[PDB]
Amino acid sequence: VSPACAGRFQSPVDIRPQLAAFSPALRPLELLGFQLPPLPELRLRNNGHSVQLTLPPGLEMALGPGREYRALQLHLHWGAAGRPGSEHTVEGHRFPAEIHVVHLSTAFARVDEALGRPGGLAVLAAFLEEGPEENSAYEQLLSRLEEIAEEGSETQVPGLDISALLPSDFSRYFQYEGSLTTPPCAQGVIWTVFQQTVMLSAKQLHTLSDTLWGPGDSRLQLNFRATQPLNGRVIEASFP
Amino acid sequence: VSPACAGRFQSPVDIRPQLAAFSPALRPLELLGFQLPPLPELRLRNNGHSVQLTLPPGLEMALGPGREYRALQLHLHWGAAGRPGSEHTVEGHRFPAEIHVVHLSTAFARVDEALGRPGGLAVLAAFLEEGPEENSAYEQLLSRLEEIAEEGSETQVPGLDISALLPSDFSRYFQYEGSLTTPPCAQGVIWTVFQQTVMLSAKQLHTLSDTLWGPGDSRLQLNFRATQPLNGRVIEASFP
Ligand SMILES: COC(=O)c1ccc(SCCc2ccccc2)c(S(N)(=O)=O)c1
Ligand SMILES: COC(=O)c1ccc(SCCc2ccccc2)c(S(N)(=O)=O)c1
Ligand SMILES: [Zn+2]
Ligand SMILES: [Zn+2]
């Protein structure tokens, strides 16, 4: 029963853009090394809570000058047939799905030293919505979900352009301080939520929500935490 | 002799208010437990680089919701007769002196763990200027310098209200991330520089700069580092 999961400053949150603070010090995010060669392959796992892709060393992310991170992994949150499952909401709207790319501050060698430390971990988050076309970067992961239908299963996938899983607009985002959304829910996590969304086909969103199985003989669906109150935190925005 | 002194994100810096970014998310500083009783006494020490007062446990400081610190020590930077010695400057203007109250994040149990980690240490900085009245708060410290004029000397002083050494409006400050201004010049220090100043008499300012002796047979004077480039860092302001 991680006591951190009862902290005052938890994630995810409902983003109310009218209450967000415009902060012009929030510059465009910068990503280096995200365009991977096909080999070595990466490991894609059904962990019973999400599908998680382990990322290789060398993916560097900066929130700004002096604010440097390395990417660890990415995973997804999703709903069910006719039910949205983003973690974050905007003005109470929940989107079909959400991607999280979790990073470690370059000041720490291990996750366990960064847990609960200010700015020790940073998450990049983007909503997934339905578009008309099959998203080619997503297809490389989604086309392998059948291989990992079973809880605790994994498979290897070719490296891909990891930045193609995210929006092209890196300028416009909300940022706030919060927590991991799974035990141990440690605080001090810098959350960056893109304004622009990513487009998947209806078929892709259905593959995501209908393929994977979780604890027991239950479908892995609706794997989002309820929104947590801001409790006086102010969400910042990189635009007015 | 410490290559970190040549890092990219060093302190101090020149503040250019018109180029600061206003972020309404920067709330008034909260400083609790700073009104110390006369007992126990505190160590005041000439360390040959500054005069330093050791602070007891219980001085709690927050830069924002869930971003808490405990004060460790305070020290000063000053010039010489008719020469200002602040560390920060404002549009190129050097103030007569500067006070620094150094704090440790509650997320770290030791200073050595915090050095080089983002937001591990936070310093509150205020400019000291010349005014016509004698300053009662500062007198408690200045009146005791004669006793510690020898490099390496120390004395015990009565408890004092540390918060009385600071400016009037805790809602009005600049903020950026930089470094210690002495070796090891570690990065990831959050600097908060009050917009308003504190006034000492000309006599008090003279007492500060003229009583203490440093390494060799030289005066302890002009104990400030040269200003360092922002290198892309944007200074934030808590007010438009
Ligand atoms: C239902 O969602 C998940 O399965 C999930 C898994 C991991 C993580 S991050 C953990 C980083 C970590 C922590 C401890 C040890 C080693 C790695 C998150 S999140 N949304 O970013 O908080 C969700
Ligand atoms: C010439 O100036 C100084 O004497 C001076 C001394 C200490 C400090 S902070 C040290 C924090 C610390 C470091 C290591 C171990 C334990 C405490 C600073 S400053 N201006 O805050 O960078 C100036
Ligand atoms: Zn997540
Ligand atoms: Zn100092």
DSSP character at residue B209: H
Alpha helices, DSSP H only, in B76-215? 111-114, 136-142, 202-210
Technique of determination: X-ray
Closest CA in chain B for residue A64: B233
CA distance B64 to chain A (A): 8
- Residue B9 and residue A233: Cβ atoms within 8 Å? no
- Considering only CB atoms, B21 lies closest to which of A25, A105, A234, namely A25
Q: What residue owns the CA closest to ligand 1's atom 16? A: A111
Q: Are B81 and B106 in contact (CB under 8 A)?
A: no
Q: Are A53 and A74 in contact (CB under 8 A)?
A: yes
**Residue B77 labeled ligand binder:** yes
Resolution in A: 2.0
Q: Residue B40, preceding bond cis, omega within 30 degrees?
A: yes
Please name the residues in contact with A65: beta carbons below 8 A apart, sequence gap of 6 or more: A27, B8, B9, B231, B232, B233
Task: Look at domain B3-237 and name its CATH class.
Answer: alpha beta
Q: Are B184 and B4 in contact (CB under 8 A)?
A: yes
Q: Is the dihedral of CA B145, B71, B133, B193 positive or negative?
A: positive
Number of cross-chain residue pairs from A and B with Cβ atoms under 8 Å apart: 79
Tell me, yes or no, if A49 is annotated catalytic: yes
> How far apart, in whole angstroms, are the C-alpha atoms of residue A83 and residue A221?
10
> How far apart, in whole angstroms, are the C-alpha atoms of residue B48 and residue A97?
60
> How far apart, in whole angstroms, are the C-alpha atoms of residue A96 and residue A86?
6
Q: Within a 10 A sphere around the Cβ of A158, how many other Cβ atoms?
A: 13
The residue type found at B83 is R
Q: Where are the domains of chain A?
A: 3-237
Cα B180 to chain centroid, rounded: 11
> How far apart, in whole angstroms, are the C-alpha atoms of residue A11 and residue A227?
7
Residue with tokens 């660890």: A72
Question: What are the CA-CA distances from residue B37 to residues B145, B158, B165, B221 (Å)?
Answer: 21, 8, 15, 31
Give the mutation target among A51, A74, A123, A181 for probing the ligand 1 site: most ligand atoms within 8 A of CB: A181
Q: From chain B, pick out residues whose CB is under 8 angstroms from the CB of A7.
A: 66
With CA atoms as reference, report the closest residue to B137 among B172, B99, B173, B80: B99
Burial degree of A132 (CB within 10 A; 0-12, 13-18, 19+): exposed
Give the mutation target among B75, B121, B212, B223 for probing the ligand 2 site: most ligand atoms within 8 A of CB: B75
Length of chain B: 240
